[PDB]
Amino acid sequence: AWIAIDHNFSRAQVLTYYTLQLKGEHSLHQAISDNDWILVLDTTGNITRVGRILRIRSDLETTTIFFDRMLQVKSVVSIGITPFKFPPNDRAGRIQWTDFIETLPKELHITIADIPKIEDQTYIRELLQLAVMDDLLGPAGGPNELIVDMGVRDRYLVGKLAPREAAERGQEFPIDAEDIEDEEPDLIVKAKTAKVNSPSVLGSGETDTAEEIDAASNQSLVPSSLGMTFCVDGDVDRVEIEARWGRYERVPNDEHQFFKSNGQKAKVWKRIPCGGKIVLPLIEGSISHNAPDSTSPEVRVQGSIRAKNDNGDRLITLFLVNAQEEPDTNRDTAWVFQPELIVRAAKDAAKPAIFRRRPVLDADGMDPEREALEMIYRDRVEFAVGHGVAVHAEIADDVTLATEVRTTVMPQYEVQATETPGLELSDRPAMREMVSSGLLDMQRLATLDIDPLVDALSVLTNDYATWIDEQNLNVSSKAKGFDTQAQTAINRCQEIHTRLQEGINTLKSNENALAAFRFANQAMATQRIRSLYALAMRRGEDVTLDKFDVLKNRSWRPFQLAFLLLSIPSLADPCHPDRVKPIEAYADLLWFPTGGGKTEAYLGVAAFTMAIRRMQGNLGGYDSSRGLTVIMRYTLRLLTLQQFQRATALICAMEVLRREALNKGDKSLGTEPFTIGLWVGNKVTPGTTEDSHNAIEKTRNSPVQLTSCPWCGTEIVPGQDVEVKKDKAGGRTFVYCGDKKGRCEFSKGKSSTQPHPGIPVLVVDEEIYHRPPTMMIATVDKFAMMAWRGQVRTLFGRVEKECERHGLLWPGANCTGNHQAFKGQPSAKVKAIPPIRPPDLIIQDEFHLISGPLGTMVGLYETAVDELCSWTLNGKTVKPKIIASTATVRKAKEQVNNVFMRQVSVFPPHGLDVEDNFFSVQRHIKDKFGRRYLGVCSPGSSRPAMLIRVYTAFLTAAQELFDHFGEPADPYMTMVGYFNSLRELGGMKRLAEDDVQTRSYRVQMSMVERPALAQRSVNNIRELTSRVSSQDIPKYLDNLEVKFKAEFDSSAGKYVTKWQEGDTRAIDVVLATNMLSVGVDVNRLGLMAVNGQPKGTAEYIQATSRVGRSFPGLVCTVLTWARPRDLSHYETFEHYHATFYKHVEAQSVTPFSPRAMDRGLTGSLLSLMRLKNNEFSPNEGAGKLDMSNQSELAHAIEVLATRAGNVAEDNARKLLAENELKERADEWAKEASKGGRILGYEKRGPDKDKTVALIKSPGLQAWDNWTVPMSMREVESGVRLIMDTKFIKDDHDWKP
Template sequence: MIARERRQVVLDHLTATYLGPRGGATEQIGDRPDLTYLVGTLFPDETDSQDEAMSADDVHIRSAQDDGSPTDDDEFEFVAQTANVWKPSSCALSILTDAPSLRIYTSYGTYARVEGERSTWRRTEASSEAVDVERGAREVRTRDDRAVIRIRERAWGNGRRLITIALCNALRSKSDAAEDAERSLYQARFRVEAVGGEILPYHRIEDLNPDEEREELSLRFRNKQVYAVGHGTAAEWDPARPCTWAATVPLPSFVVPKVLTRAGTSSALRLGRLAEIESDRAGVIEELSSFVSDYEIWTEEQRSMAAQLTGFQGAPGRIVERQVKAVARMREGIALLDRDDAVSRTNRRAFRLAMQAMRLQMEQSELQRRRDMGEQEQSVDPTWRPFQLAFILLCMASTADDGAADRHLVDLIWFPTGGGKTEAYLGLAAFEIFRRRLERGPDGAGTTVITRYTLRLLTIQQFQRTAALICAMEVMRRLDPEVRELGDFSIGLWIGNKTTPGTDKAAVDAFNRMLSQRDPENPFQLTECPWCGGKLFPKKKSDPSRYGAKNFAGRIVLRCPESCEFHDGLPVEVVDERIYDNPPTIVVATVDKFAQLPFVPEAGAILGARPGFAPPSLIIQDELHLLSGPLGTTVGIYEAAVLGIIEQMGGRPKVVASTATIRAAGEQVRGLMGRDVALFPPSGLDDDDSYFSTTGAPEDGRLYIGLMPQSFTQARSVVVALGGMLKAPDVLSEYDSDAADDYWTVVAYHNSLREHGRTVALVRDDVSSYLQLHSNGKDDGRRLRAGNPLELTGHVDASKLPESLRRMEQPCTSEDAVDVVASTNMLSVGIDVRRLASMLVVGQPKTTSEYIQATSRVGRGDVDGIVVTYYRANRPRDRSHYENFINYHQSLYRHVEPTSVTPWSGASQDRSLPGVLVALVRQLGDRWSGDEQAHLVDFQSGVVRNARRLITDAVRASDPREEEAVVQRLDELLTEWRVRAEESRSDGDAMAYQPEMGKSGKRALTRSFGDGGREGWVVLPSMRSVDSEVAMWIEGES
């Protein structure tokens, strides 16, 4: 079976499980049907609300446009009154049509107890003939009188009518569960056809007052229209144009097509060919020019298309203008390699070395992959994806020349998850590392590149990938005398000390503990040799030679236990003290770690704030969209210190970033860094084509299923939802014995730790019971392994994360295979486990960006992913997403919300400005950087004046409205610091920057959060919330 067929088998199985009927149109089941099927049930009416709801006075529709066009927010109050109850008795949809009449088809089943068998229920199919409804009709009964179709319409100008059709259970409740089960309608749905006309699209409410970005979204998604809105149900419609039918769908599904990267054929994509830039300069330059010309031809086609588009204001012109600018910048990058001066010769050599390093790294990664998969080893010819090479060319001029016009521009790679963004910016990083070493020689020492992430799991994974590039550069250095002269290359992991050791002593102690442990816990995070893939540490206590670390004169050196090039030592540092002592070429860090700048004077070394080390010239910010809300706000104000220190040390770093989902990028980047932004690739005039990427066939991609249970508790709903998904491999194996692993591991994704905890408990008890109950008497039915589920949250011990990733990679035949991964948003970014293909999303995530990122974790390999989104009927936001399921999923990226950061707001100043000021003054002033030298600051010095200027410049660039308030607060802080320093000196006391634990009488400039007994500014040790979660209980309650 091909992947698409396997996915269809699973969809059919889940449909039978959630909606029914499992056994066909005349099935017999052993449980009450209302306790068996989660969706599609219309219960007998328990109130008189239906009749009241049909009153014309209760119909409220907002006309939001001058032409009277409805929007997809319009709905009838009578639907809400009957749809929001625990046991809904109706479902409905609304359409806009010019048709004079409608044809409606209804479909449902009923169940009755089999006489003499109290526990057996038999189904009867009750599909009706087509019902023709003329203009003005209000009510039509079905043939069996068990259901009634109610119609309400309103004239909408120009012969159009806004019509709501509701299918209602015509029977009344008997207040007896068994009798009501017989009086209910199951698998209920209907379809409406426009006779003599068509169904017209709704107008979106956000299109009424669009800004430039919304204008462009309307243009790009102009072919993704809304033709029906569900009420208490989802709606679907005719994919052809004109649209002639719409229908309710209780279990909606939609395939989001795969995003395909353009598979270029240009020889310029071959890294081996690009590495010939010095030996065949003219040939390589010509091939690069031809590569850019192919894109330029496409932009001209876009220009011609834009001229034909009307009704979109200036949106088409702006889109094409950005494409033309990108072409020009790529040509600047090529020109950088094609001049005859010394600078261009250096650039050509750096480009050649970068291509060689990336080629070597890609070859080694492919070799590792083949070994892991048991495939035959063979030579490969690594190539760039077209967008990767284009991005490198686009950024080269502004990266190599700190005086370039675009140096201050943040270049943002905007490409779908899994598209290869990491390799694109690593290629640029390799170019800059070699260029700086070739240009400056020993003066180019220090950290050249800082890559920053928001989540430690993502940081650790990306550290492993980046370390492979550094290893490739080190291999080149050992083999090539030309590269050897450039000095060592290294990489450092700079994250929290709960994850990696902060000092050499802590590292030695941790390693000694590891050697004595029966089940060694890795305190160094790196689990595999980044070069050969060999395991660095044994799973069980072993001979010390099998451990990938050694104690070298009180310093821990990581090494590969295998006989590879790095047996004696890896070019990797994970101990803070080592990173400060000799700043690595690349530092991989969490953004949160930069909160240490006020407290750790040695940390400034990686920013160039120590003699002998040049400041970084390239900063890479991964997953930019995660820098939003409180975290983004705090990162934004601390960026004044980070960029300020680098600037004061003579640097002007190039900044690149990456994201798969973003809106209002210009506002976010300006708030974070006070810089303008350029997205790459620039969007095309259609959402599914940016030249560098297109969408695949409509039937190939990730399948989304919407599940909003009725009259079921959340606990019961999750059990059935998960149970059905966990049974899918058994069902699939009946068709294809090789397919068991395709959907074996189910990821359960949650929006909160509370819901995560509920699911963990359910998996351990109820889900196991469900699987046993539905094993159909088979002894070999699915059983959950002991130790499941695997939990992946921010509360999991950092030392266990690498092992968790390893276990998720294991196939179903392994004893370490995982049945269920219970996760929070920790999983939503950077996790790349290609065998994961099945996910249950418990509740609509808070943002569309998170939804896209989280669900993109499944279906990244050869198996098409399946995502079941469980909506809670009592949550208005969940309900809205369910009712608009098709509309939402056909244009997911259109629904991404703008991100918000306000680093210079009053609350942010109070929380973070003291820390930023201390960081700048302490890092830039050698004479008062010591722990107990805060009283020695010279407030008339250039250091203090520069700190004030750097902060003022930052707020002016980011949010000039706040400049006056920030300057006033800044002066207040400096005055307060000066007064306290004078008091300390007059008393003959020292003033520390930070109080030591247990010395309550010691004078200090700052204090810890919650330490109300001391004087001093509160400076947070973390950029995240400092609120702790505590367990609570009520006395007398069990």
């Protein structure tokens, strides 16, 4: 019941809506408390707002009031009719209750219970941030607070300086023995037990392991000083320095009335403010010691000042040291809490902006990419650096000058949001024309005639050319000092426009291309509609198909269509220059912020490639109506299994349209269907049909890699939906849909007559090596199997013979193509067939992880993959097309030339600014929210103590926000914890369900005052990692989408949850390693707590970007003082978070070094020797190397030496490779002529009693020439520990 007067002091708009700010210390305003109504006016005397108070905070000059319910008056109401008194002398004034209650309906047309509640969520993220800041940093009870029943040093976690005597001797334990000696024992002890646990954890388990590391202690350290470093302009004389801190003092017993449980008095401390301002002349030399506050003269400020530099500025360093002395009783009165330093200009200067850039720190070397990066980021300027603390600067109107600098203990910074233009009212008019008239509709673009097609596609290129035209007015005007880079930027955009027009021209002068374009658009639109229906059905909701067929769902995004038009002319003709010459063959590289659709961008190219290949014909004497087309290869193991589900839907839609087209007599698409297979290790998938039978046999008393049907969403039961045909030499495994009525096209009622019935997949390896699919999704490490197994050459199309009953044949197989009549099937005979065309496209994802030893090992084995996929056409040699995709680009040119041996073409190009390139727009904080970051660094404490405290603070502050506001707090009620290793996650897992629940239950059960936290019950904990079984993963991902349920109780006056019988519970804490493989854009998750700085920048950007996509996000990185990388990042926090891409760590890919030639050379030689010829294909081919076969050895040797010379660009490497290959070839040549034995590759088969092996495996012996690896990475096998359990008696006894 108060009346105040507004004066509009606060700056941020969201804060100014929901707050009232008063002047003066809170000691005058002690009559105002929580749950109070205040009625806010303006200066003239007009009623504007009516609100209710949530919280009060205070400072040395101002007090801020936060609301929880508020009404905004729309009309104009005067104070004259109000019976009340005007505010006394612009302070607070008391309201009579009755007149306020009577006037609320009379002159405001409202009651108490009709007040609407606050709905914004930026307000809520602000309140949560303030709560955690108060509880971890302080002061919490104001500047004149009282602390009861505990010591001041352990109350707070961050930002405290020790006296100098303590810092030299260090620590051995968090608690000193002499400071705890009370008369009584600690009476508030409780038994150290997992009390009332009820963990409700699923407790899934498996087998996995990771790496390990170590560091020095975080216990034996405490600092006693902090500083900064700033560079100042010349021709000035003096500056102003302000320092403030806080001090604590013990209140004697007769002065308070706070009692313990047993009637005795308790310890009470009190806080007093400190600090003052000084003025310092600018003379070269070390600064004299000075004391700002006279009452504590033994705390200082110091530094040094250096001479003038080459430009006209000066370097100045400043510190702040505690040099006090340690007493014997009440040792905490010599510690300094909450320090801060401010440096500004003098009070009487003419111009304030005197702080300039740090010197560039040049090193007499230039890299054009680096200068381009400095040109792009020219409005992010780094002014100062902190020593044992973080820093902050205030930027003037000029973006190269600053007026104020200071220090921050826990720093924050908010990042702008990348979006695609087209929806806002301030974008380019042509994009709004495209959206409003519907020229990106995928159904519309498949039915247009050719001339309206050119009309529609021309607008994009016209507007791109226009944008480049206004980009050229500012070469020397706005980019001063960077003329060379401002020209090289425009050159590549002009090349991009040229290639777009070339693509449209190729589309105009062809008919196969137009047919393929229409086919790809139709298939993509259908799959895009149906995937959402499948996801809705699998979760058990009730939906129909016509709900999802609206215009929102079947439209393109401009960079995807642009990539498609770029990609056309190289695939529509094998005679294009990109595929016939070894120089200037541009390999496209696509990079973009994560969240935009790169995956649907690069799946359309595969669809177009698949459709166009069957419309060409048997060019060059090669078959072209069947065989493998597109290879799609990845690095990890789990993301492959996640992407296979996405690829199946496209294959299904293509099969549907192929089946519907043939019914009209149109045979352009052919007869053979489209199928897709995996190619991963033998742990996940079976090898032969016998094992596929064994798995189903063991099931009824694993080829089932699918859980639900892609096309319809019916549950797949493994018991009855699998058929394995009998196998005298080989069989075919089929998987059917689980529909019972018979309306799905992939059930047993409809598809039984097709050449490939049911779901068109392949899982078994020998099934793939007989009928090769159209598409393949593999992992990198499987490619090392080429030198072992000789039947892989079917995948590249090197075949001769075929059996009608089994499939394609290789030398040394079971069936030779002849049979008798049996089960009534007619007898058949073998036939000969011309060869098949090798694949056309290679696709690589997560290309930034191809670096280091993995990158080198990929690069050396890629000599064979490029060689085997080649062929001839009119004398020329045709080579495949390569596409890669990354998240961060850095030194891409050398990486692509070393791995793939091509040129590079990064799309989309740079532009002159980081904010306004053509296809992306980096929006503004005033109009769309961002992703705030926050940082915590603290010495002394252990890593478990910091983790427990941060987790408890977030969990209990979120609950307090829930209790007053309701359902908008839902994003911040479930906490995600991201980790870097399995061992540390295992360590934290024990602490999660034992300690945090106990510390969160008893959060308000002592006499210490905690203003913001609240009572919370923790019940549910899950975990997402590689040790979770693959059947259970989609159940956990589908559990994360349930919301916390709320209900309003008028007895307590708040909201409360209640869970009915047989209902699912929401999850409280979720823990996730590297594999944060979130399936969809999960709308709930909006709070993550990173635990430790990752070893890479790309990983940090990938992991932290998942949270906060539909609601505002908030990340808190927890850093440790004892590690170098963490401290280095802490001191430079606010600059690293504004220039991400400038700071990407280095990489290297170097095959053909001696250490990599000692590993990969024999494997590559044998792979090229085996998978290309017929005499060396079978297992007994090792003895065949005669004096008549050596001409193929020369071919392989020449290929390897040529690539080594072309990539290393030095003749020494070529000479070295030639010598190594010659030695290996001669070593092979000696072993052939040793008669008396039968020589082969492995000891295998019934002839093994006289077989002598040639090559080996990594085992007991040291490495050799003939050791051939089985993966791209190996650790030597470990040693196992052998426990002993027994009893030993201890007769010996202790003594003083």
